[PDB]
Design a binder for this molecule. Sequence first.
Ligand code: DLP
Ligand code: DLP
Ligand code: DLP
Ligand code: DLP
Lengths: 327, 327
Amino acid sequence: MGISWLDIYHVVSATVPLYVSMTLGFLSARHLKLFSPEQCAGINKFVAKFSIPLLSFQIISENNPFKMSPKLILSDILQKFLVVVVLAMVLRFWHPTGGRGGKLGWVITGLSISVLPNTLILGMPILSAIYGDEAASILEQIVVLQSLIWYTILLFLFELNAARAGTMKILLKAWRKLIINPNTYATLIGIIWATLHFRLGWNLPEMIDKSIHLLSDGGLGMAMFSLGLFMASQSSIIACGTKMAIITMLLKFVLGPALMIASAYCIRLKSTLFKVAILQAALPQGVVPFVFAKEYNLHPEIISTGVIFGMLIALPTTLAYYFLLDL
Amino acid sequence: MGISWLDIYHVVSATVPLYVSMTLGFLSARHLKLFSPEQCAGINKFVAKFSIPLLSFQIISENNPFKMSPKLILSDILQKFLVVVVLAMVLRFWHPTGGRGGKLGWVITGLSISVLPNTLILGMPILSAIYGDEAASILEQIVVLQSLIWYTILLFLFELNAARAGTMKILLKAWRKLIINPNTYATLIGIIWATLHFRLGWNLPEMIDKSIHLLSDGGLGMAMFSLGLFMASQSSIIACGTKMAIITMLLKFVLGPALMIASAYCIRLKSTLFKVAILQAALPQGVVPFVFAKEYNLHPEIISTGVIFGMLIALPTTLAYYFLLDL
Ligand SMILES: CCCCC/C=C\C/C=C/CCCCCCCC(=O)O[C@H](COC(=O)CCCCCCC/C=C\C/C=C/CCCCC)COP(=O)([O-])OCC[N+](C)(C)C
Ligand SMILES: CCCCC/C=C\C/C=C/CCCCCCCC(=O)O[C@H](COC(=O)CCCCCCC/C=C\C/C=C/CCCCC)COP(=O)([O-])OCC[N+](C)(C)C
Ligand SMILES: CCCCC/C=C\C/C=C\CCCCCCCC(=O)OC[C@H](COP(=O)([O-])OCC[N+](C)(C)C)OC(=O)CCCCCCC/C=C\C/C=C\CCCCC
Ligand SMILES: CCCCC/C=C\C/C=C\CCCCCCCC(=O)OC[C@H](COP(=O)([O-])OCC[N+](C)(C)C)OC(=O)CCCCCCC/C=C\C/C=C\CCCCC
């Protein structure tokens, strides 16, 4: 009914291609030694500047902004705000790596981990099967919200952190670096388009659609490839260590879903919407935050280890959360 | 009937996405300066090692080897043999760029130009519209033949040229470098699969299909992006000069189709098969030979310029050949 041995195969089939691309990249960088560190950085930069922005535009444009659930958006925003508050407060007392400082980069890493899960590739096969078609729409809205708001805010935070190493000048520099990002323009053009298309009926010219799909089609595969390329340069598969890996897992699969449950209860969600909203926050970490961290070199090892170890822990964790919510 | 103003739009729509990726890459390398030469080389290496081989596997596997036209295969082989003979004989008297040696590299460039046109992306919209469904199958068989035989032989020739700078040792070195290429294994596994699938009914597991499509979907777009990246490093758009550009155009749009006509007459093709066979040889140059030339650094400027200026000359040239063949 809710779970069978055929939907588990669907989850495994959704997860395996990503790991295959990851392993291909890792072998290429380490064993085959096809790519040098500069070439790996170039591949990651191409993914960050052309693949992710075009994926974001494709996701946002094909979503009706006027059919989005206001309560889902409020729940997502409240979850992000609660996670930010918790990360800011905890860092005030307990600081990773001995209390050196840099509490803004740690908040960026914590937001990349906790509140930006992989919602489409791995979140569809399990949640849609367990619940149905409502889960599909909810997850699509969540992914649209990610690409539209949360990636842009994450990039702004990355640029603000980079600018920090009198305050208004730093914010101005971060903003100036943002308004040249392909991602902010992707989100703006995508939302403007979506509005025109779903309110005026305009259809994207076939030439432009094909042009976008030509370069954006392999975005996810290249993101996993870049993750493997980065892993090839690390001493061990757990690049961040055992303690930091445990902390990453706790943030992703306990803090994330717990604060999402708090957000859903505060917003007073009900039924399938509530259940899918609090179950999607337990989905694995996702690779776009890793791409941004690698581009800005902000603890990419932690994000990569979380991504690698979350794709395996998602299914048991999603099943555990489903069973917990059932009774 | 044969040609209208709606099929011209189809040709333009097929051509434009490639030029859009080309221009994006060119701007990135030259104006935005996102990629350094090492990073551009890394992107091209990824395209050559993962995109083109997986595209070749997809093309070969999805083609029934037992339904291929023997006469079409014979005509293609005879074209290639005649073109090789002509290139070898002409180089014996007239040498490009004054007078020097290196006649094997010039033959490789001449084969990349004359006898490896872009058959699917730009060859479908015009030939299928003018003729119908027979053109589709003929062009698919031609593309399968390319990916299966001609890319492998071109790579072997590239490796043989590289090894040259006593003869049996050079051939052994070229063979050893070949049997580690992803392309030879792609073709071999693709043909073995195609055989099993179309003779025993085996279906490729969905996981493997998704894994291949994850890394191969953005293959052509990245190839055009790499072409733009290379163009960004050249002094002028006509990287090979005016005389060499003219020679490239003559080889692609006169020698290629002319020797295809000779081959078809020798093999005694008839009707739509004959016409499509001799009209597909006039299609533009295609980017995979450029990717290989850039990887081996064998006159990449000439192949690049031919690709630049053939996508614009193909439609008038294809129309001219169609009118010539009509009467
Ligand atoms: C438009 C809606 C709002 C969206 C937000 C975007 C833009 C507007 C906001 C701009 C301000 C950004 C924060 C600057 C604060 C500087 C403080 C300082 O002064 O130092 C900061 C301290 O930071 C903090 O503790 C936390 C700051 C805020 C964290 C992030 C805020 C997130 C914003 C909105 C919620 C949504 C989040 C999700 C986004 C990602 C997607 C999941 C860093 O330096 P430090 O003092 O720790 O150095 C060490 C010095 N010693 C050793 C002496 C102590
Ligand atoms: C399995 C079926 C057959 C497929 C072919 C593959 C493998 C088997 C063949 C192996 C031999 C390869 C050629 C080595 C010859 C060395 C000659 C020499 O000694 O020098 C060669 C000379 O070359 C030539 O003139 C032409 C050689 C042959 C050209 C290519 C042959 C193509 C093969 C098959 C037909 C299909 C082609 C299409 C493939 C691409 C897809 C469109 C180079 O040096 P050079 O002397 O000019 O130097 C200069 C010295 N000075 C200045 C003193 C003169
Ligand atoms: C509305 C009109 C049609 C669409 C054109 C408009 C915007 C496209 C978005 C971004 C590129 C153009 C605007 C970017 C700001 C200008 C600066 C720039 O040139 O910034 C390139 C960007 C950052 O690089 P930088 O740090 O070197 O900047 C510094 C460059 N300098 C060294 C020269 C100073 O780098 C990059 O790769 C830029 C991204 C290149 C790949 C394209 C991604 C586009 C994403 C989504 C939209 C896609 C399709 C359109 C949908 C249909 C609409 C009807
Ligand atoms: C039959 C069993 C399943 C398929 C596995 C078999 C073959 C796959 C093809 C190629 C990779 C493995 C064999 C390659 C030869 C071994 C050498 C190697 O490791 O060579 C990697 C190749 C060249 O690199 P190198 O010059 O550094 O070699 C020197 C490396 N050392 C420095 C260590 C000496 O580089 C590369 O990227 C290699 C290519 C990596 C990307 C994969 C492309 C595969 C293409 C088509 C087949 C795809 C899917 C399977 C279809 C379904 C089948 C049922």
